[PDB]
Amino acid sequence: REYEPGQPGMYELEFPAPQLSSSDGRGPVLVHALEGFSDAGHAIRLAAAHLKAALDTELVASFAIDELLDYRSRRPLMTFKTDHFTHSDDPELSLYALRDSIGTPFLLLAGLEPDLKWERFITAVRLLAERLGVRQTIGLGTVPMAVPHTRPITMTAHSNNRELISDFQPSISEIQVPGSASNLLEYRMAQHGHEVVGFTVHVPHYLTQTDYPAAAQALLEQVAKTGSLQLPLAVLAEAAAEVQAKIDEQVQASAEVAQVVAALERQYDAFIDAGAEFERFLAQQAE
């Protein structure tokens, strides 16, 4: 009986570990992208998927999703063809090693946000990140906002190093937000002296429950910038513009909708001429 090494009931290591040292010889960036907390425009799913599809990807550790998942809250999708079941869409939670367009290795934590054992999960992710010499941890988030899809995508950034988010202008005072595994990971990681940064992309609220690839693009572009990675984005941008074109059509068809969007454009332009909405929208998504 062969025991596949790792941490029992948490993760299995995939052998062998990849090489994660750069040309300059410094540590990898770690990007985390967990679904189940706030998935407006399904931006997090699409961002992770693209990286995996568009880049060289190797499994480093697969987490014990079966021990972490509430299957009755999030039932796996099954396929039925005529008179029998033909496919099961199995949930995943994994740590990947990727290489960017000039072969710079980085790590990707992606899959379902676990329902259970956040602290054991997060301690495990940190230990792995430390063993692999992670220099910077980057989290992805989305949040619905009263913004149009016809104006540039906006984004709130958070970090424990103010130099890392100097391109941003914080419009938030002390607030209380529901926790996510990603946010708690970011925080626990910070309590241990690791450099963390996260980006929460703003998605028009009427697009909350559809694929909005542009949102993913914005996140990934920001990841490229902050982590010194070169990410092949063209296919995502292509898909993003395709969806944009289709959304324009559904609006220029319904006089009702267009006013809603136009009204949002008007308001968008006012803010540019220069927290509580963030708190209300996150709490709704967290349920």
Q: Which residues pair with 158 in a beta bridge?
A: 198
Q: Which residues pair with 95 in a beta bridge?
A: 61, 109
Task: Looking at residues 118 to 137 of the shown chain, list those that interact with a second copy (rule: CB under 8 A).
Answer: 118-120, 123-124, 126-128, 131-133
Task: Looking at residues 217 to 276 of the shown chain, list those that interact with a second copy (rule: CB under 8 A).
Answer: none
Report yes or no: 22 and 104 within 8 Å, Cβ to Cβ. Answer: yes
134 or 251: whose CB is closer to a second copy?
134
**Does 179 participate in binding a second copy (rule CB under 8 A)?**
yes
Smallest distance, Å, CB 150 to a second copy? 28
Task: Looking at residues 101 to 120 of the shown chain, list those that interact with a second copy (rule: CB under 8 A).
Answer: 113-120
Report d(CA 10, CA 62) in Å as an integer: 9
Task: Looking at residues 135 to 164 of the shown chain, list those that interact with a second copy (rule: CB under 8 A).
Answer: 157-160, 162
Strand, helix or coil at 198?
strand
Out of 56, 58, 101, 177, the residue judged to bind a second copy by CB under 8 A: 177
User: Which residues lie closer than 8 Å to 227 by C-beta, 6 or more apart?
Assistant: 29, 31, 106, 136, 138
Smallest distance, Å, CB 66 to a second copy? 4
161 or 252: whose CB is closer to a second copy?
161
Report d(CA 49, CA 57) in Å as an integer: 11
Out of 52, 178, 267, 268, the residue judged to bind a second copy by CB under 8 A: 178
Task: Looking at residues 58 to 87 of the shown chain, list those that interact with a second copy (rule: CB under 8 A).
Answer: 66-67, 69-73, 75-86
Pairing between β-strand 105-112 and β-strand 93-99 as defined by DSSP bridges: antiparallel
**Does 284 participate in binding a second copy (rule CB under 8 A)?**
no
Going from the C-alpha of 186 to that of each of 87, 152, 211, the distances in angstroms are: 35, 27, 26
**Does 11 participate in binding a second copy (rule CB under 8 A)?**
yes
